[PDB]
Design a protein around this nucleic acid. Structure first.
Lengths: 260, 62, 118, 176, 139
RNA sequence: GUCGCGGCGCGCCGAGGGCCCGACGCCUGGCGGAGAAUCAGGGUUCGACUCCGGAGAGCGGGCCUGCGAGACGGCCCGCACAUCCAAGGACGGCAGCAGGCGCGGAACUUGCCCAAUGCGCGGCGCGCGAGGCAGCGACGGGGAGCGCGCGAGCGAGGCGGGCCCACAGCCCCCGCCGCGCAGCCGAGGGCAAGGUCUGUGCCAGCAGCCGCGGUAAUUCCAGCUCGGCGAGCGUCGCGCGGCGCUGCUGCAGUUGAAACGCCCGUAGUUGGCCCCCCGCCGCCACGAGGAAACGGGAGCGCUCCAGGCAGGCCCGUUGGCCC
RNA sequence: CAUCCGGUCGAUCCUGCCGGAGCGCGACGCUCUCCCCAAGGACGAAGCCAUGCAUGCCCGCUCACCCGGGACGCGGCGGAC
């Protein structure tokens, strides 16, 4: 009751975070910022778990206090800084830069990018609202707020942010045929072209998209993020959201464990 | 209630007989195996017999 | 009685100038005579050039077998060890001495008394 | 709350429905001499393992053949059984999994494997040898007689060079 | 009987709820009138100070004088008559000694020849009564 | 009035509103779920307790501060219940941790420390009875012993040195010594194991139940053997199973317990045959959406195992997926 | 992951309960060679509490007899988690 909760229990923490059950009785409490807890992952987790660059939380703080890493080109000292889709995690001292995307199994993935790709990051406009004397504002999934958008851009239409001048670069509007990557739910982590959008007036527009496996996945507009027109635009993970099935992944697991 | 424990106070005292201490653990079950199955020399007199029979006993000592 | 010590999956960490790795020390029918003895052996693969610069940690010896695995923290430079080091690890090695015993109960009792004294 | 509170625990054995039955007692004693089993609890753990497996196959078999489920799990169960050596590697059918008996699981116990390999004279001798840390399952010392060897590991099993034989030559009785 | 219809679940639920009460077993377990009646008051054991000692004639056919101590439980000040198990073990019990008394074994029913006695002595003065009989401990 | 909506409060005006599809009252040795126990299928019982939401800090109230508290390791008041006091006054609140008393059948150290895991605050780490570390602890779960062989061995120990640790310690690794160690319930049945040998004489006792003992006790009390189970075994209370003795599957009602004495009868429940091709309802399938733990379940030799998410030059190594 | 068995009789077949047979999870007794994991003042007293302890950190603003230590206060943030 009373005010806000500043603590997170390990088993309460989102499953995709893949934290150990016996690893701790507490989990990093993700802070507010550009991504929410359900759709974020703490900076400490990328550095401590996947990168393994810092052995302990204390080492991650030391590195962050010295501004070793810069997200979106800005050095951030927040161990619990929220990180999500299209965020550019570039560590210059190690000389390696990657984007944070979604794996087919739904865990966030670090996908390496070239210097041109590092410069820009994609965004999704939740809606356009009027405030402060009537100027229009567009709110991206990363909560980035852009005053005076070009009139054609609409709700749910992916746009690209320069991230150097931090302005809109181009708009790939959401329409039938355009390639999209699911961001949430059962089909999270899957890139498919849009077969159809069901209006479902009243609540929950539900869209059907199908990948090159002839398998159609049905997902509502909330977790559909356009990634270029028919072209996949920004570089996509090696699996490419092709939906490996459980039996197929069983063979892949066995080949990997064949190696000793 | 003045007759309480009439048998216990007047029963004679027979000392516990000292014995070869029995093997314990899997070793006890192993020695129980010769009796029960392969072997059978101690448990048979032309036919199957019970482990506490008065005929198995005296033929196996006690 | 031969000892073979190998480094696996070494990590370049310019941020903490360290060389994180996993050490496989093979001492079949033998006892490594302390981590320092195999620290020189680990140094050969690590190529740090200073045995003291190398820090060795978590050398679990497997039940019975001579496959013992220990994380390695050969700092690239001495400044890194000087800063990014568990004060206790620095104490285990002997790089620095430990502070004289303090009650800590006294450190809390002092806090309680110092607040009451306004 | 503590991390320990979160940890799982399991009863891996099934006690009998009637514990003074004559057939069960006779077979148990015959099995006890055969495999050098310490208490009926070790035999009980064997029955449990067979019952789990038999039920898993049973459910997959009630499911129609080619039902995604049997393909994903039935293949996994057969694989696991063939790889522990409980199941013959030629049978390779889920229906065969049901026709297994606890004795066959007990056969893969290292104490039985050592005896068929002959590295020891008796099942009693095999238990004592494995306890003395003499046995090696292949580059690994094993102290537990219970150890169930995987079919591949059987060839790797040999008396460890460091032990009673081929060694210092002076432990225990030799020292004095 | 067995009214069965696709939409008749409520009638069946009511019948089971009302009829289930008829068994003595459901009532003794769930009515809970017994909990208030139970001298033990929902406990396996109770600690009470011996207030009386007596010999209860065994129910015919069996004949003997069973040895018992009448004890008032400390918990509820509720009278209990408790059998002393083993041979001549009332000698171990002394009046005002304080005993732990546990159920005789039939869940509130008198057991065996002893008449209308539902409790047995398991401990005397901090020492187990069986242990006193087995000579494990003394006085 | 409130952050706002609302009888929420107040006026004003009507007479509604709820109820055998159980209202209202009453009682609860009532936190609820995720879950747990037992378990052919169906089921039954519990859910204080690990995660999530709720509620309370002796009891009622009332407030202030703040962005958020009707906050009690804040305040103010009554109410019980304490302490100090030089007698005027002062002052609390362990359903935080250890620890004490009472109570009960029942329950652990006035330890050690932030090194981790988090959090508060700082940019060059500090605080934390959150948490971690040790002690206690047959709640329990898991693994190896008390020999094997007929001569060779082990590990239980003991001592060093590593390894481990905030510091110890434990584990494990090595040298050097090395000393295996079983109970608890039973043997008339049910129920596995003498129709033995003593005492005793319907006494003393035993016996869940059948029963046993009154001179030849297969039953008591003891030696004797034997049997079960096993570092555990016995007893008690309860849950579940047994019990198709609660019955939907799946009970019974001539006589064992049980068809209302009869007819009408509303609620309730149940309704013959018929139209293909549409609209609603159930209905079945498959989705989506939202917590993991748990339970399944892929893979992985924690030496085996209860475990855990591992691991190893690795599907962008994994940690799938179902519920 | 489907089971029964003793007791109403001179005998017998029933119905019917009674009692056993299994697993829990708490107590209680007796006993315990090592190692691993692990519950632990909930059970009609949300009874009462002696002591010690569980909430600080900051350095904004230093004219406190080392120094630029960073007392103390003031401020700030948390104490509502």
């Amino acid at each position: 009751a009373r005010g806000v909760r500043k603590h997170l229990k390990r088993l309460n923490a989102p499953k995709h975070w893949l934290l150990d059950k016996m690893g701790g009785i507490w989990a990093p409490r993700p802070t507010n910022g550009p991504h929410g807890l359900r759709e974020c992952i703490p900076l400490i987790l990328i550095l401590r778990n996947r990168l393994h660059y810092a052995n302990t939380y204390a080492e991650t703080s030391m590195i962050l206090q010295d501004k070793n890493v810069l997200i979106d080109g800005k050095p951030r000292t927040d161990p619990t800084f929220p990180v999500g889709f299209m965020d550019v995690f570039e560590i210059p001292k190690v000389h390696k830069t990657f984007r944070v995307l979604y794996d087919v199994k739904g865990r966030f993935t670090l996908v390496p990018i070239q210097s041109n790709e590092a410069g820009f990051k994609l965004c999704r406009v939740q809606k356009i609202f009027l405030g402060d004397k009537g100027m229009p504002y567009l709110s991206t999934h990363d909560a980035r707020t852009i005053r005076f958008p070009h009139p054609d851009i609409k709700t749910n239409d992916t746009i690209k942010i320069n991230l150097k001048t931090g302005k809109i670069d181009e708009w790939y509007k959401f329409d039938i045929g355009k390639i999209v990557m699911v961001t949430g739910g059962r089909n999270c982590g899957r890139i498919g072209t849009i077969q159809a959008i069901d209006k479902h007036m009243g609540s929950y527009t539900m869209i059907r998209m199908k990948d090159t496996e002839g398998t159609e996945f049905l997902t509502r507009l909330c977790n559909v993020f356009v990634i270029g027109n028919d072209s996949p635009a920004v570089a996509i993970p090696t699996t490419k959201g092709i939906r490996p099935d459980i039996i197929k992944n069983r063979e892949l697991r066995l080949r990997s464990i064949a190696k000793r | 209630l003045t007759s309480a424990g009439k048998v216990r106070k007047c029963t004679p005292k027979k000392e516990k007989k000292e014995k070869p201490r029995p093997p314990r653990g899997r070793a006890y079950k192993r020695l129980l195996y010769n009796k029960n199955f392969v072997d059978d020399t101690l448990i048979h007199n032309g036919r199957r017999l019970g482990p506490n029979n008065l005929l198995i006993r005296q033929k196996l000592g006690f | 009685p031969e000892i073979t010590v190998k480094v696996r999956k070494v990590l370049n960490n310019p941020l903490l100038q360290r060389q994180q790795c996993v050490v496989d020390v093979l001492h079949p029918g033998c006892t490594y005579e302390s981590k320092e003895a195999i620290k020189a052996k680990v140094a050969q693969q690590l190529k740090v050039a200073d045995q003291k610069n190398i820090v060795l940690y978590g050398f679990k010896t497997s039940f019975g077998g001579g496959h013992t695995v220990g994380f390695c923290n050969a700092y690239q430079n001495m400044d890194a060890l000087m800063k990014y080091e568990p004060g206790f690890r620095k104490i285990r090695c002997g790089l620095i001495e430990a502070p004289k015993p303090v009650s800590r109960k006294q450190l809390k009792n002092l806090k309680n008394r110092r607040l009451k004294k306004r | 709350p503590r991390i320990s509170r979160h940890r799982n625990s399991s009863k891996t054995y099934s006690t009998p429905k009637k514990p003074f039955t004559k057939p069960r007692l006779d077979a148990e004693l015959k099995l006890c001499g055969e495999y050098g089993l310490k208490c009926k609890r070790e035999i009980y753990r064997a029955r449990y393992m067979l019952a789990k497996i038999r039920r898993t196959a049973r459910n997959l078999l009630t499911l129609d053949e080619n039902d995604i489920k049997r393909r994903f799990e039935g293949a996994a169960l057969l694989r696991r059984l063939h790889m522990l050596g409980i199941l013959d590697e030629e049978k390779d059918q889920l229906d065969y999994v049901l026709g297994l008996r606890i004795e066959d699981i007990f056969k893969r116990r290292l104490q039985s494997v050592i005896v068929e390999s002959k590295l020891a004279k008796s099942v009693h001798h095999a238990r004592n040898m494995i306890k003395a840390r003499h046995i090696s399952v292949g580059g690994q010392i094993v102290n537990i007689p219970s150890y169930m060897v995987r079919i591949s590991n059987t060839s790797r099993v040999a008396i460890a060079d460091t032990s009673s034989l081929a060694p210092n030559g002076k432990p225990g009785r030799t020292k004095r | 009987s067995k009214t069965s219809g696709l939409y008749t679940a409520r009638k069946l639920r009511t019948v089971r709820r009302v009829n289930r009460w008829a068994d003595k077993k459901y009532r003794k377990a769930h009515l809970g009138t017994w909990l208030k009646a139970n001298p033990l008051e929902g406990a396996c054991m109770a600690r009470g100070i011996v207030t009386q000692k007596i010999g209860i004639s065994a129910k015919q056919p069996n004949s003997a004088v069973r040895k018992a101590v009448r004890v008032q439980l400390t918990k509820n000040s509720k009278k209990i008559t408790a059998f002393v198990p083993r041979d001549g073990s009332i000698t171990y019990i002394d009046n005002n000694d304080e005993v732990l008394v546990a159920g005789f074994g039939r869940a509130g029913r008198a057991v065996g020849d002893i008449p209308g006695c539902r409790f047995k002595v398991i401990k005397v003065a901090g020492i187990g009564l069986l242990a006193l009989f087995l000579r494990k401990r003394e006085k």
